[PDB]
Each structure stands twice: as C-alpha cells, then as structure tokens.
Amino acid sequence: SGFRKMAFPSGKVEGCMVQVTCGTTTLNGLWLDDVVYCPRHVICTSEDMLNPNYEDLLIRKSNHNFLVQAGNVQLRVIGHSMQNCVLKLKVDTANPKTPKYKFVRIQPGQTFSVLACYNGSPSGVYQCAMRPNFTIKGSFLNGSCGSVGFNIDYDCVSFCYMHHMELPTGVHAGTDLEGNFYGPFVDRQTAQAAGTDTTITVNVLAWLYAAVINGDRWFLNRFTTTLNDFNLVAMKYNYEPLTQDHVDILGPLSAQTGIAVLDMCASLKELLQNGMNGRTILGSALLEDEFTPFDVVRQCSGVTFQ
Amino acid sequence: SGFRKMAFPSGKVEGCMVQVTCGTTTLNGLWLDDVVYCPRHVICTSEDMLNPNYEDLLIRKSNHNFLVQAGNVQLRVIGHSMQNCVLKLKVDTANPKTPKYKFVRIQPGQTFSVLACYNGSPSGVYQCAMRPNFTIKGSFLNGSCGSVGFNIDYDCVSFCYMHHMELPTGVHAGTDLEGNFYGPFVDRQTAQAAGTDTTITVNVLAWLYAAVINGDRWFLNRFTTTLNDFNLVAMKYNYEPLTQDHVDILGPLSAQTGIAVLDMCASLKELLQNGMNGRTILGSALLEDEFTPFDVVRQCSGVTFQ
Ligand SMILES: *[C@](O)(C(=O)NC1CC1)[C@H](CCCC)NC(=O)[C@@H]1[C@@H]2[C@H](CN1C(=O)[C@@H](NC(=O)NC1(CS(=O)(=O)C(C)(C)C)CCCCC1)C(C)(C)C)C2(C)C
Numbered sequence: 001s002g003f004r005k006m007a008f009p010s011g012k013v014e015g016c017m018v019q020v021t022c023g024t025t026t027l028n029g030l031w032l033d034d035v036v037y038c039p040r041h042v043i044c045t046s047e048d049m050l051n052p053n054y055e056d057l058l059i060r061k062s063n064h065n066f067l068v069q070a071g072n073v074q075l076r077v078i079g080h081s082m083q084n085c086v087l088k089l090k091v092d093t094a095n096p097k098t099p100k101y102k103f104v105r106i107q108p109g110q111t112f113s114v115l116a117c118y119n120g121s122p123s124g125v126y127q128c129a130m131r132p133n134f135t136i137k138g139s140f141l142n143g144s145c146g147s148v149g150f151n152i153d154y155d156c157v158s159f160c161y162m163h164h165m166e167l168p169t170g171v172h173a174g175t176d177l178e179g180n181f182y183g184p185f186v187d188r189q190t191a192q193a194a195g196t197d198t199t200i201t202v203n204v205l206a207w208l209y210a211a212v213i214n215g216d217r218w219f220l221n222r223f224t225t226t227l228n229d230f231n232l233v234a235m236k237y238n239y240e241p242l243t244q245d246h247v248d249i250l251g252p253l254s255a256q257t258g259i260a261v262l263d264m265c266a267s268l269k270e271l272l273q274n275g276m277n278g279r280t281i282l283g284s285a286l287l288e289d290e291f292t293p294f295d296v297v298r299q300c301s302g303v304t305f306q
Numbered sequence: 307s308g309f310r311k312m313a314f315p316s317g318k319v320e321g322c323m324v325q326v327t328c329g330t331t332t333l334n335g336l337w338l339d340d341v342v343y344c345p346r347h348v349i350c351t352s353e354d355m356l357n358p359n360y361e362d363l364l365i366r367k368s369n370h371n372f373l374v375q376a377g378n379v380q381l382r383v384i385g386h387s388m389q390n391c392v393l394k395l396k397v398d399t400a401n402p403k404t405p406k407y408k409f410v411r412i413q414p415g416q417t418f419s420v421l422a423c424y425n426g427s428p429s430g431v432y433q434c435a436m437r438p439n440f441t442i443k444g445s446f447l448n449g450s451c452g453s454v455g456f457n458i459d460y461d462c463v464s465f466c467y468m469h470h471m472e473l474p475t476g477v478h479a480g481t482d483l484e485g486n487f488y489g490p491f492v493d494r495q496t497a498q499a500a501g502t503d504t505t506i507t508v509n510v511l512a513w514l515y516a517a518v519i520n521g522d523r524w525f526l527n528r529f530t531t532t533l534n535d536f537n538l539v540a541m542k543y544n545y546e547p548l549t550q551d552h553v554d555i556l557g558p559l560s561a562q563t564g565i566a567v568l569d570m571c572a573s574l575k576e577l578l579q580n581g582m583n584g585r586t587i588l589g590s591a592l593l594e595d596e597f598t599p600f601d602v603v604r605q606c607s608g609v610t611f612q
C-alpha cells in the first residue's frame with residue numbers, strides 16, 4: 001500500500017541531455033539521433049529578450065557559434081534551423097543512446113515527469129501536471145531551460161514538454177518538442193496575460209479512489225448526486241466541469257472499490273461545501289488534483305515499463 | 307523558483323535491477339559486480355512466514371534453485387550465502403553497468419530516493435525519508451520486495467535501503483545492503499512493536515526556509531526564543547529536541563535568507579500553538595518534515611550529479 005507522487009524512471013532520458021552554449025547563455029539540449037533540440041532564445045543576449053527578432057538574430061549567427069557538449073566528449077554543429085520556438089542543431093554524431101522516442105502534445109490535466117537539468121547534467125526528477133491554464137507548477141532555476149518532460153508508454157519515451165520561461169506568479173511555461181508553446185505565451189520578456197487556474201475534477205476523484213484503496217474512508221457519504229447538480233457545486237469553487245466521458249474513464253477505479261462515480265461525486269459534493277474540519281486524506285490536508293486516473297491504476301496495480 | 311519533492315535520477319540504478327525467483331516466489335535483486343543481493347525470505351513458502359528457520363530453509367536449497375534474469379539474459383548462480391537478512395547470489399557474469407556504488411546506513415531524519423521495481427523492471431521513482439521510528443512512508447505492492455533506496459553523491463551511488471515488508475499502519479520497513487534491519491523488526495510474519503513517530507524538527511525548519519526563498523513569508527513573526535523554551539513547545543507536539551548541531555547546519559539557509567535559526571523557531575513556535583487557520587505554506591496546509599537542509603540547498607542552488 002501507500003501513495004506518493006511518482007515520476008517515471010529517468011534512465012532513458014539522461015543519455016539524451018547535452019550542454020548547449022551560445023555566447024554567454026548556457027542551457028540544456030535534447031540530443032536525439034543527430035539533432036539537438038533547445039529553446040531558440042539561446043541565441044539572444046541581455047537586451048535581446050526584450051523584443052527579439054529571432055529571424056534576424058539567427059541569420060547573424062553561424063554554425064561555429066553553437067557550442068554543444070555531451071559530458072567531456074563534444075559535438076560539432078553542422079546545420080542550424082528554426083522550427084517554431086525551438087532550435088534544430090544538427091550535429092555530425094548520432095546519439096548511440098537514442099531510445100524509441102515519440103513527440104506528443106498533451107492536454108490540460110495530464111501528468112508527466114520532469115528531468116530538471118543544469119549544464120546538461122541531470123539534477124532531479126519529479127512529477128507534475130499541465131494545469132488547465134497551460135502552465136506547470138515545477139521547480140526551475142537559471143540554467144534549467146531545455147529540460148524536458150516525458151512519459152514512457154512501455155519502451156517508447158513520449159517527450160511532451162521543454163522548459164522555456166517563468167511567469168511572475170512563479171509557475172512555468174514551455175513548448176512541445178515541435179516548438180509550439182502551451183498556452184497563449186510568446187518567448188519575449190514582456191508582461192502577458194495568464195488564465196485563471198481551475199481544479200482538475202476528474203483527477204481529484206481518482207485521488208479519492210486512491211484514498212479508498214489505501215484505507216481512508218471517512219470522506220465517504222451514502223447519498224448520490226446527478227451529473228448536473230454536482231456541476232453547480234463544482235463551478236462555484238472553480239472546479240472543472242465533469243462530463244460523461246470522465247465517468248467512463250474512472251471505470252476501473254469504480255469497479256475495484258465498488259463505489260460508483262456518482263457516489264464519489266456526492267462525497268466530493270459535500271467536501272467542497274463544508275471543508276474538512278481539520279482532518280487529512282492520504283496524509284494531505286488539501287484536495288490533490290495532480291493524479292490522473294491512469295496514475296492511480298499504476299500505483300495500485302504495479303504497471304512497469306522498460 | 308518552485309519547490310517539489312524531487313527524486314534523484316535513477317539511470318544508474320535501473321541497470322542493476324534483476325529478477326530473482328525461488329520456487330513460486332519472484333522478487334527483485336540488486337546486481338553489483340558479480341553478486342546479487344535480495345531479501346532472504348525469497349526461499350520461504352506461504353507457511354514459512356509464521357516461523358521461518360532460515361538456516362534450515364537455505365540448506366534445503368541448491369544453486370540451481372535460484373534463477374536470476376536481467377531482462378532476457380539468464381545469470382547462472384554459482385554460490386549462495388546468507389548475510390543477516392539478505393541473500394547473496396554470486397553469478398557467473400559481472401554486471402558491465404556496475405556503477406560506482408557504496409553501502410551506507412542512514413540515520414533517522416535523512417532522505418533518499420526509492421526505485422520501486424516489479425519482476426526486476428523499474429516502475430518509478432519517488433523521494434521519502436527515514437522516520438524517527440525507523441519506518442518509511444513508501445508506495446509498495448506485491449512483487450516490490452528487493453526495491454532499493456539510494457542517494458547520488460556526485461558520481462557515487464550510495465545504496466542505503468532494501469524493502470522487505472509492510473506494517474499494519476501502512477508504513478514499510480527494510481534493511482540496509484548489509485542485511486541489518488532498520489529498527490527492532492525481524493523478517494517473520496508475527497505481531498511486532500513499532501515505535502511512536504515524531505516530527506523531524508530540523509527538516510520543518512529547512513522547509514520553512516525554502517518557503518521564504520520562494521515568497522511565502524506570512525508566518526514570520528517578530529518574537530524570538532532561546533534553545534530551551536522552544537523545546538518545551540516542540541516536545542509536546544512530538545518533535546525532536548532541537549540541538550545546537552541543528553543550528554549549525556542551517557547556516558547556509560540562514561545566511562541566504564538573513565533570518566536567524568532562533569528567529570524561525572519563534573515563528574514555528576506560534577505555528578504549533580495557534581494552528582494555521584486554513585492557510586498553506588509552499589502549497590501545503592501541513593508542516594513538511596521530509597526535506598533535509600541539504601535537500602533545500604539542492605533545489606535552491608542547482609546541485610547536479612553524474
Ligand atoms: C532559461 O533560458 C535559462 O535557464 N537560461 C540560462 C542562462 C540561464 C531562462 C531561465 C528562466 C527562469 C526559471 N529562461 C528565460 O530567460 C526566459 C526567456 C526570456 C526571459 N525569460 C523568463 O523566464 C523571465 N520571465 C518572463 O519573461 N515572463 C513573462 C513576462 S513577466 O514575467 O510578466 C515580467 C514582465 C518580466 C515581469 C514573459 C512570457 C510569459 C510569462 C510572463 C524571467 C527571467 C524574468 C523569469 C525569454 C526569451 C522569454
């Protein structure tokens with residue numbers, strides 16, 4: 001038993017991390033085959049971030065301006081190209097540790113593991129979720145740009161995030177591995193609007209099911225609620241609308257615990273209105289929304305990977 | 307910025323996990339050089355748990371009763387020996403991916419990363435701490451026995467834990483890599499006394515320093531205390547006696563934030579007596595004691611490893 005925030009094993013991603021330097025800016029790059037992916041704003045200076053012209057800046061840059069290192073052994077940049085907000089630094093050596101990689105663009109509510117790197121060296125791994133406002137609550141300092149988020153299907157590493165920048169609130173934003181930002185953000189140092197964050201309801205319900213499997217059962221009621229009456233209670237506390245598809249996704253968890261989704265909704269319908277009086281659920285005093293239904297099945301069935 | 311429970315990169319540990327099978331029992335083993343380490347109760351059946359005689363049980367077993375597989379490769383066992391509560395299976399092939407390993411026995415209050423494994427395959431990594439009662443709050447199912455805990459010291463992997471069994475309270479217990487259990491426990495299915503769990507005070511203080519660096523400063527008061535008055539409040543709510551040694555390690559955190567340790571103790575002093583009042587520090591409504599001051603320095607400075 002037990003329940004903790006689990007990140008995927010980072011072994012297959014550590015071998016793809018390199019150091020990328022352009023002038024005085026040093027950040028991380030993703031070395032897959034003979035291509036090195038990194039944030040395109042590595043070619044900028046201090047006052048270039050304020051209003052950059054990336055086309056004009058890349059043109060004044062040449063191949064010997066990019067310094068790519070993989071540990072002590074180096075790589076020679078052969079051809080630089082731009083794809084949206086990421087830089088394609090092609091090299092003369094193909095990565096022998098290239099795994100079965102995969103480029104995916106995730107939806108708000110899905111979780112992934114982040115391998116935080118500095119100077120091309122892995123520092124730590126942790127799990128987080130893409131918030132409904134297309135930001136992530138991660139842990140990043142200077143030098144962490146280029147760190148990637150990923151999942152493992154089985155042997156297929158699914159890259160889905162690359163860190164770019166930090167918001168004034170303290171959350172973080174980035175792109176997929178094709179250079180397209182998550183959200184309405186642009187890679188420019190200027191104040192931009194960020195949306196209001198909501199609570200992922202289908203994730204809170206999966207977390208409550210995890211609490212039932214582990215023994216926490218006090219939050220449970222005997223009543224039921226509609227699929228519409230619950231949405232009234234949800235949409236006040238800035239919770240996210242619950243659909244019929246979410247009920248079908250929670251099938252496995254509903255069948256193992258013998259508690260219908262609409263029954264667990266009635267338990268959640270009561271918790272949001274009254275509070276918790278000062279109790280705890282799974283060792284937490286707040287409701288957790290960073291566990292997808294699939295994350296709960298992994299921790300309560302032992303799903304392993306390559 | 308940011309702060310999340312962060313685990314060490316598990317790349318160097320994934321290549322050491324193998325599958326050990328003895329009869330019907332299949333669990334995980336640690337492959338370092340030409341030795342495989344696994345819990346000794348792999349030789350037990352279902353009836354042996356109540357009262358196992360490990361000497362008499364091991365004698366009835368031979369080298370060909372132990373089958374070890376590192377994925378698709380079979381490791382033929384040559385010599386089996388028993389050291390405390392772990393079994394050694396010397397195989398004919400040395401692990402070519404043997405990292406720079408190291409066997410350590412951690413103290414209560416220290417943290418480490420756990421690589422939960424099933425059938426010799428890594429399932430995920432998470433961070434936890436050794437509780438003062440020599441238990442850990444982990445996440446383990448059936449087949450997870452043999453999963454190891456570790457720290458990464460630059461280029462040296464420090465193995466410090468191997469999972470063995472689960473307690474009635476939902477917590478877990480195990481041994482070091484020499485076979486010596488953490489705590490008074492013995493590997494036998496029989497009611498066994500566990501100790502009262504206290505809160506690691508030096509970790510809560512370090513966690514409060516992390517909140518100050520990240521922006522959370524509402525809990526800072528204007529009082530101050532010595533080292534003895536705070537211990538009266540701490541020892542009632544089950545915290546560890548705060549010693550002068552704990553004040554000395556928190557230097558880097560106190561020097562960066564400009565807040566003395568005795569100053570943070572007064573702010574903590576009010577936090578135990580008056581509660582928090584539906585408030586959250588670092589996004590948590592409870593006080594966290596699973597972050598050593600070394601962990602906080604790591605996330606707030608950028609320590610990487612090999
Ligand atoms: C990353 O590139 C890196 O690690 N580089 C190596 C050299 C150290 C670096 C690190 C981010 C902090 C964790 N990322 C950046 O420098 C990017 C790029 C420049 C500025 N930033 C960035 O993160 C800004 N944040 C920022 O610009 N946020 C906004 C504007 S704001 O934050 O509202 C304000 C007007 C500055 C107050 C822009 C985009 C949307 C969010 C708001 C800070 C360095 C100030 C944190 C690029 C080109 C965007």
Ligand SMILES: *[C@](O)(C(=O)NC1CC1)[C@H](CCCC)NC(=O)[C@@H]1[C@@H]2[C@H](CN1C(=O)[C@@H](NC(=O)NC1(CS(=O)(=O)C(C)(C)C)CCCCC1)C(C)(C)C)C2(C)C
Binds near residue numbers: 474
């Ligand atoms: C591990 O061997 C494994 O993963 N095997 C693979 C093949 C399935 C397995 C993991 C189980 C839970 C994570 N570990 C065990 O089976 C050990 C060994 C037998 C029994 N257990 C075990 O964990 C017991 N727990 C237990 O016995 N705890 C106590 C006694 S008790 O819990 O108070 C009670 C009287 C049984 C209620 C003894 C040890 C100290 C704590 C108390 C359970 C399977 C019941 C969880 C060994 C040989 C100890």
